[PDB]
Amino acid sequence: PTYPKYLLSPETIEALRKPTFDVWLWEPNEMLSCLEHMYHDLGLVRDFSINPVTLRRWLFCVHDNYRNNPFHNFRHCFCVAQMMYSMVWLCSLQEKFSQTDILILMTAAICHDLDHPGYNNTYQINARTELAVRYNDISPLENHHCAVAFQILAEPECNIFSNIPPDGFKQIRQGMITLILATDMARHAEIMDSFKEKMENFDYSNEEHMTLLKMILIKCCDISNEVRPMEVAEPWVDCLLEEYFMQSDREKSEGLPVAPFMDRDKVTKATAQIGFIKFVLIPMFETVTKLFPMVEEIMLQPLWESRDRYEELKRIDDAMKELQKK
Amino acid sequence: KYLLSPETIEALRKPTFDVWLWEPNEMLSCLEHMYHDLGLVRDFSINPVTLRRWLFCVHDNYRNNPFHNFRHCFCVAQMMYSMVWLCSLQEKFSQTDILILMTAAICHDLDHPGYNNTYQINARTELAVRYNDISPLENHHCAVAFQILAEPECNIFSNIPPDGFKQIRQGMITLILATDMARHAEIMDSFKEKMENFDYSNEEHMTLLKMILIKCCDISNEVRPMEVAEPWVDCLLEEYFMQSDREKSEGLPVAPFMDRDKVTKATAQIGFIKFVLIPMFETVTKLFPMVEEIMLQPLWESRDRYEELKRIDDAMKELQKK
Numbered sequence: 001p002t003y004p005k006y007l008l009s010p011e012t013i014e015a016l017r018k019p020t021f022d023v024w025l026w027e028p029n030e031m032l033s034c035l036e037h038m039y040h041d042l043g044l045v046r047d048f049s050i051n052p053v054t055l056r057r058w059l060f061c062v063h064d065n066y067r068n069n070p071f072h073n074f075r076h077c078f079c080v081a082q083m084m085y086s087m088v089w090l091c092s093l094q095e096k097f098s099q100t101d102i103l104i105l106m107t108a109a110i111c112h113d114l115d116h117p118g119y120n121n122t123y124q125i126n127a128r129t130e131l132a133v134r135y136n137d138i139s140p141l142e143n144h145h146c147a148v149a150f151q152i153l154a155e156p157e158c159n160i161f162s163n164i165p166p167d168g169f170k171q172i173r174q175g176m177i178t179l180i181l182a183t184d185m186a187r188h189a190e191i192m193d194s195f196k197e198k199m200e201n202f203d204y205s206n207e208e209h210m211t212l213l214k215m216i217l218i219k220c221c222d223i224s225n226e227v228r229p230m231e232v233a234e235p236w237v238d239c240l241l242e243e244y245f246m247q248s249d250r251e252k253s254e255g256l257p258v259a260p261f262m263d264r265d266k267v268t269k270a271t272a273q274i275g276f277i278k279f280v281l282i283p284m285f286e287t288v289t290k291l292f293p294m295v296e297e298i299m300l301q302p303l304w305e306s307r308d309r310y311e312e313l314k315r316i317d318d319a320m321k322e323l324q325k326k
Numbered sequence: 327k328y329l330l331s332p333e334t335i336e337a338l339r340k341p342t343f344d345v346w347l348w349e350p351n352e353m354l355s356c357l358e359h360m361y362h363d364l365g366l367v368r369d370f371s372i373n374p375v376t377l378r379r380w381l382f383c384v385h386d387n388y389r390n391n392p393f394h395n396f397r398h399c400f401c402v403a404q405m406m407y408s409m410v411w412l413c414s415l416q417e418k419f420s421q422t423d424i425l426i427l428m429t430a431a432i433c434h435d436l437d438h439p440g441y442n443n444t445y446q447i448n449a450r451t452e453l454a455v456r457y458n459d460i461s462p463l464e465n466h467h468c469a470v471a472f473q474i475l476a477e478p479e480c481n482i483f484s485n486i487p488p489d490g491f492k493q494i495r496q497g498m499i500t501l502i503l504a505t506d507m508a509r510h511a512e513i514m515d516s517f518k519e520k521m522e523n524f525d526y527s528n529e530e531h532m533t534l535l536k537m538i539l540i541k542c543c544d545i546s547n548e549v550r551p552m553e554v555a556e557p558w559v560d561c562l563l564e565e566y567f568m569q570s571d572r573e574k575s576e577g578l579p580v581a582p583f584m585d586r587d588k589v590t591k592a593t594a595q596i597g598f599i600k601f602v603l604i605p606m607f608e609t610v611t612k613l614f615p616m617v618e619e620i621m622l623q624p625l626w627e628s629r630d631r632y633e634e635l636k637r638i639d640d641a642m643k644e645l646q647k648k
């Protein structure tokens with residue numbers, strides 16, 4: 001017969017390995033089954049004796065702890081994990097990384113924006129929120145995401161690590177913390193600089209080199225929307241701006257500072273994306289390409305096309321503005 | 327009692343001050359005096375009644391641990407106060423820096439639970455999970471400090487402009503987080519690097535000096551006269567043995583240095599004085615030579631005395647073996 005949606009077809013299973021996967025086609029249950037499959041498919045269930053039922057419960061609790069923000073929601077979580085999954089296959093990461101490292105990457109990706117409130121660190125700090133006070137202005141959101149991740153994993157019915165020895169858990173915990181804290185965009189230039197420094201002579205034996213690579217990998221997946229095919233990427237920009245404009249409106253309403261790049265009166269879809277693609281995305285992916293040359297064709301290529309497309313869209317926008325004042 | 331005599335007010339400026347004489351209310355009075363005396367009430371328009379409520383609230387948020395209690399908080403703040411005079415810190419530091427040093431010293435162990443970071447992390451406590459194994463205690467003390475200051479009737483900074491508040495907040499956070507002894511060798515190395523060519527106008531150099539100062543004050547019990555210092559060691563062991571007892575009956579690792587069956591008063595202090603305190607104050611002395619006679623001197627005497635005590639302890643164990 002026709003099988004229910006939460007039973008994934010073999011065509012989906014195949015497409016899921018690839019950064020072209022249409023993240024918009026699927027509802028929560030289907031995405032949850034996708035994530036479940038990734039853990040089996042990567043041999044993490046096997047190698048860490050993950051109780052398959054616990055794995056399902058864990059993913060449900062994770063889902064429940066993402067909020068319905070326009071951008072930072074469960075689907076974003078899914079995108080980031082699915083891109084990590086894609087990159088494992090694209091870059092043959094199982095040749096370079098231990099199974100513990102693959103587990104860290106994947107689990108960090110799923111958990112990295114848990115309970116995001118839809119207002120970024122600058123709002124937290126300037127508004128002196130409970131979170132900013134709790135974390136002393138030090139990456140309040142990312143600290144909170146990581147805290148919630150391990151609150152969940154401490155509930156015995158969600159503890160996918162229950163059959164891992166304590167030493168393994170400590171290693172996994174520390175790695176996940178490093179990775180989730182690395183997603184604070186305030187630290188972007190710092191982290192890129194450290195990574196570029198190691199790239200002068202990269203060493204897969206060197207644990208510090210590998211820690212930085214993993215930080216770069218999760219950072220890549222986190223902001224990877226523009227790597228996806230245009231029709232998959234475009235809607236995310238509207239989601240982003242909806243969330244960002246919600247924050248700038250609120251900051252105006254409360255007399256707090258407003259960042260120009262988030263201002264509803266100054267931002268267009270094109271200006272939101274151009275500099276971000278050219279100066280954040282492209283250079284980051286360029287450095288990764290040096291270790292994984294296959295990344296150029298699969299991920300740099302769509303970024304170049306998206307850059308050109310948004311640059312053209314800005315010319316059109318500018319000409320249209322000029323026309324109504326000439 | 328509530329009113330401090332002139333003798334007390336005077337004695338308060340020196341590291342010989344007998345911290346054990348006084349009850350909470352008099353200690354509160356001493357701390358209040360320090361804020362007036364240092365010019366902090368004047369220069370930051372601190373409301374005089376708010377200052378007293380703030381101190382009362384602070385006191386309320388210290389717990390009755392054997393060691394990490396309100397009197398420890400008083401000792402650290404009183405030693406900071408003493409170092410301001412000894413080292414003439416008001417010639418080197420702005421009043422904003424003095425306020426940061428003093429306020430951080432008062433707040434730096436707020437709501438300490440009586441079990442250190444190693445316990446928090448190994449036992450996967452609520453605090454360790456909240457703070458991701460990153461200096462959980464020190465992050466907590468800091469959070470509680472600004473929860474207190476967020477209460478309007480406790481807000482001694484309510485008349486500082488926002489820019490000033492942010493500067494103070496950042497400074498206090500840095501200093502309180504710097505008290506995590508896990509970072510001791512790191513912070514010492516950073517400071518000794520700057521001490522290669524120290525520069526009072528370099529903000530990065532001054533941040534490290536302030537971190538070293540609050541650190542000096544936090545672990546300064548043994549600088550005090552023997553009769554004042556010795557009882558702190560009993561308190562220390564009492565608190566630490568509590569933890570190692572608990573770690574043993576929960577199956578968690580126990581550090582030999584806190585092991586009730588392995589530790590003596592003397593073995594707890596000799597190594598600490600020799601390889602932690604003395605070297606730290608030696609580096610500080612290079613900036614402030616007056617520190618040598620007032621602070622390194624008692625450390626040398628304490629070291630020698632505990633090494634003598636150890637010989638008797640050892641002789642006693644020779645009479646007990648079988």
Ligand SMILES: C[C@@H](Nc1nc2c(cnn2C2CCCC2)c(=O)[nH]1)c1ccc(Cl)cc1
Nearest residue numbers: 185222223224225226240261271272273276
């Ligand atoms: C306007 C915004 N553009 C943008 N921001 C993006 C994207 C993906 N993730 N992010 C942000 C969301 C939180 C942080 C990364 C994206 O595709 N575009 C933007 C954000 C930061 C900078 Cl530095 C410049 C532009």
Ligand SMILES: C[C@H](Nc1nc2c(cnn2C2CCCC2)c(=O)[nH]1)c1ccc(Cl)cc1
Nearest residue numbers: 507545547562563566583584589594595598
């Ligand atoms: C090595 C350490 N000794 C020690 N530790 C001290 C002192 C003052 N503060 N502290 C520690 C309390 C945590 C910041 C260091 C002190 O005078 N001696 C120690 C030995 C045995 C036990 Cl049981 C506990 C501590």
Ligand SMILES: [Mg+2]
Nearest residue numbers: 112113141183
């Ligand atoms: Mg985030």
Ligand SMILES: [Mg+2]
Nearest residue numbers: 434435463505
């Ligand atoms: Mg402390």
Ligand SMILES: [Zn+2]
Nearest residue numbers: 076112113222
């Ligand atoms: Zn994210």
Ligand SMILES: [Zn+2]
Nearest residue numbers: 398434435544
């Ligand atoms: Zn202390």
